[PDB]
Design a protein around this ligand. Structure first.
Ligand code: ATP
Ligand code: MG
Lengths: 115, 147, 59, 116, 73, 269
């Protein structure tokens, strides 16, 4: 995980995903007692992107279709970067959180959001 | 088949599997395991019940419920109660397992219940600390996993 | 006024139009903002559901 | 035990079962035995079982026991409370609030429980 | 039984066909109910979709209840 | 890290729980004050409805525009149980029907949270006021109301509606929208003219329904806050209960470690 090994684009997408989750972890106690509605406008937006990122990190495996029954997914490094970069930029702010859970690629989240 | 719709539909048990029954005290852990033994009175699976560190009155009640339900003729009951030696409580699960293995080695099917595997660990900890053997996490011996 | 009953629907301040007229300009003044928009701003339902769901978890 | 053999139902009151556990911890330390979890004696469950298993309903009579229980640091997971609760059939809780109301028996109907 | 963390690693291959097919719709209903159970008291005015899931969730939960010493075939 | 940090966190949560307990009772008291201020305005509204009714009927030759073919109320403090969101979720639903039908929409904002919802989405406004006391006075609403009544007279607005929560009960705050504009045997003596009086009565009636709406929303704010502070107190207890289990584990673990070290050193010396 170094700019000289993987390139700046991948390194920035990862640094950005981590930055978002870290801040969400810090807000946990306030939301636990007062809820999400007391947060600042920017904090509410991050908490929303942090939640989508959390479920887009989920993936059905080919060794787990026996446990669940859903089919496995293989995601390339190119598709992985494109999906998280889009959620961080806000290109997917109109989809429900549950459209990102177990969807493999981002296009499947767009097609999952149609239901 | 345990005979419980929740368990048999969502948490199925297959012949040869090890399925842990975990929870706090007084929630039906024994109830679930004894009903699973009672349901094998017509399946053809012989059953064994190992009571480790239990009260004598609790052991007596379970045996009566097994005979009242027609399941005692298929069951072997191995008892090491709360006042018996720690050595007997630590060895009872291996004795019951040996009795259950008699059926598995001859091409037959068997079911074994260990009433409190946490009471076997407490009995083995007592013997280990009385032989002056160095303790680890929560004062348990170093080979508690292997037990 | 009626034969049986007399009602006085009494005001709590001078109702001179100028006062309300000033009051209206004062409210108009407070309504001025840097991003007035077009008037067709919408699609908040996604956000309204996102916060509504968090409010369910809160209770 | 003698009265039970006579053909009677007997009450055995133990002033405090925690002090029975502590006396066992003290004796175990004096004899030089290696201490267990939270500093209790390695024989904690066996010493409790040897006492509690004699209190039962036989085919001649029945010894029923009322035992006062103390909880160290208000922790119900501590080895002494944990071991004792394994041999209890009922729990009677006496409430300071109920006493103020004027009900002298003072047993809390919501906190008190029985396996029967 | 807590259907959220209770699991069988080799059980899938052991169920009979009838129970393996019919059990499909039971665990999912309890999962859908897990997210609405506490909030259910003020969900009578929410979207019809949520109400269908909640109605089913309260039913399936009730059906899973069973008694001691009474095994079903 | 250890038992030291958990004690500070259990004390921190216990202090906050005691004040949120009081704030629920303070809120209940303020709810009862706002409910009597609601009832001290019904007589002026029920009698003016009768007069505006009969006066039109005996004077059919005059048909005021208000009688032929949004004001939004929000809080100034937080701690509400999503009371502002639930109304703002009904404001967006009705506005959609009109945007689909093709009409434009002008808005009047009373309170701080209403302004926040519009600055956060670049929404339009024609009038606005906030910082109204928990005890509001009708005189403050006159300015904001006037910017809206003239519109309807100048045709700048075809219909006017008040958006506020309604105090259904101590546990229920129904978000609602109602139309402000448009709306026996014997006859009255008119001084100076009937038309002169109808124009005066209709403004007093709309400014009255707006004041009725603000006061009721304040009663809703107090009730919503009561439930939120109850929820916060309960949630705090759950955290205290969970932390206490972790503290007991840390306490028991610290004792076993020390004994091992004492025994270990004594088994060498
Ligand atoms: N299906 C059931 N219907 C009614 N009561 C039940 C049911 N299942 C269990 N119980 C009751 O739960 C109580 C505790 O059950 P049980 O003694 O088997 O639990 P346990 O976990 O093994 O307790 P222990 O720790 O003492 O061994 C008993 O009173 C039992 O009758
Ligand atoms: Mg048991």
């Amino acid at each position: 995980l170094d700019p000289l090994v993987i390139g700046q684009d991948h390194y920035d997408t990862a640094r950005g995903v981590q930055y978002v989750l870290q801040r969400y972890k810090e807000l946990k106690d306030i939301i636990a007692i007062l809820g999400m509605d007391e947060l600042s406008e920017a904090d509410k937006l991050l908490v929303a992107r942090a939640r989508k990122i959390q479920r887009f990190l989920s993936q059905p495996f080919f060794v787990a279709e026996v446990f669940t029954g859903s089919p496995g997914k293989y995601v390339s490094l190119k598709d992985t970067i494109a999906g998280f970069k889009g959620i961080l930029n806000g290109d997917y702010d109109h989809l429900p959180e549950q459209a990102f859970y177990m969807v493999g690629g981002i296009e499947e989240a767009v097609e999952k959001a149609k239901k | 088949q345990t005979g419980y719709k929740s368990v048999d539909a969502m948490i199925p048990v297959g012949r040869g599997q090890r399925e842990l029954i975990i929870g706090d005290r007084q929630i039906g852990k024994t109830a679930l395991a004894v009903d699973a033994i009672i349901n094998q009175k017509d399946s053809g699976i012989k059953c064994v019940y190992v009571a480790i560190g239990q009260k004598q009155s609790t052991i007596a009640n379970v045996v009566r419920k097994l005979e009242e339900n027609g399941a005692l003729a298929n069951t072997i009951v191995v008892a090491a109660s709360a006042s018996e030696s720690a050595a007997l409580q630590y060895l009872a699960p291996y004795s019951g397992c040996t009795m259950g293995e008699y059926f598995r080695d001859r091409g037959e099917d068997a079911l074994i219940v260990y009433d409190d595997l946490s009471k076997q660990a407490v009995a083995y900890r007592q013997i280990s600390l009385l032989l002056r053997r160095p303790p680890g996490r929560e004062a348990y011996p170093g080979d508690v996993f292997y037990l | 006024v009626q034969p049986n009953m007399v009602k006085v629907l009494a005001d709590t301040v001078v109702r001179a139009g100028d006062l309300d007229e000033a009051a209206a300009q004062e409210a108009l003044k407070a309504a001025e903002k840097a991003l007035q928009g077009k008037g067709a701003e919408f699609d908040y339902s996604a956000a309204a559901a996102r916060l509504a769901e968090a409010a369910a978890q809160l209770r | 035990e003698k009265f039970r053999d006579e053909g009677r139902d007997v009450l055995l009151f133990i002033d405090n079962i925690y002090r029975y556990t502590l006396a066992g911890t003290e004796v175990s330390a004096l004899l030089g035995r290696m201490p267990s979890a939270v500093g209790y004696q390695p024989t904690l469950a066996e010493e409790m079982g040897v006492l509690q298993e004699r209190i039962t309903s036989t085919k001649k009579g029945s010894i029923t026991s009322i035992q006062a229980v103390y909880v160290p640091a208000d922790d119900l997971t501590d080895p002494s409370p944990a071991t004792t609760f394994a041999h209890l059939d009922a729990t009677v809780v006496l409430s300071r609030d109920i006493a103020s109301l004027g009900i002298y028996p003072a047993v809390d109907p919501l906190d008190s429980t029985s396996r029967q | 039984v807590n259907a959220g963390i209770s699991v069988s690693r080799v059980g899938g291959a052991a169920q009979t066909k009838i129970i393996k097919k019919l059990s499909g719709g039971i665990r999912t209903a309890l999962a859908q109910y897990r997210e609405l159970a506490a909030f259910a008291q003020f969900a009578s005015d929410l979207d019809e979709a949520t109400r269908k899931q909640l109605e089913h969730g309260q039913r399936v939960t009730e059906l899973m209840k069973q008694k001691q010493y009474a095994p079903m075939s | 890290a250890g038992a030291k940090e958990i004690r500070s966190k259990i004390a921190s949560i216990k202090s906050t729980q005691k004040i949120t307990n009081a704030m629920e009772k303070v809120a209940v008291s303020k709810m009862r004050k706002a409910q009597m201020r609601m009832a001290a305005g019904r007589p002026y509204a029920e009698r003016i409805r009768q007069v505006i009714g009969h006066l039109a009927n005996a004077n059919p030759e005059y048909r005021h525009p208000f009688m032929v073919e949004y004001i939004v109320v929000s809080s100034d403090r937080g701690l509400c149980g999503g009371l502002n969101i639930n109304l703002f979720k009904s404001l967006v639903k009705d506005m959609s029907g009109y945007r689909e039908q093709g009409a434009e929409i002008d808005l009047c904002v009373i309170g701080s949270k209403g302004a926040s919802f519009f600055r956060s989405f670049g929404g339009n406004v024609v009038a606005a006021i906030s910082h109204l006391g928990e005890e509001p006075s009708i005189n403050d609403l006159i300015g904001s109301v006037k910017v809206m009544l003239d519109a309807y007279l100048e045709g700048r607005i075809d219909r006017l509606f008040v958006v506020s929560n309604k105090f259904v009960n101590t546990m229920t705050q129904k978000p609602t929208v109602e139309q402000l504009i448009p709306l026996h045997h014997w006859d009255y003596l008119y001084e100076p003219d009937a038309k002169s009086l109808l124009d005066g009565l209709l403004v007093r009636y709309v400014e009255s329904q707006v004041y009725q709406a603000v006061v009721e929303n304040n009663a809703c704010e107090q009730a919503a806050r009561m439930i939120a502070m109850k929820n916060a107190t309960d949630n705090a207890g759950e955290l205290i209960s969970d932390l206490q289990l972790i503290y007991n584990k840390a306490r028991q673990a610290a004792i076993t470690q020390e004994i091992s070290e004492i025994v270990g050193g004594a088994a060498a010396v």
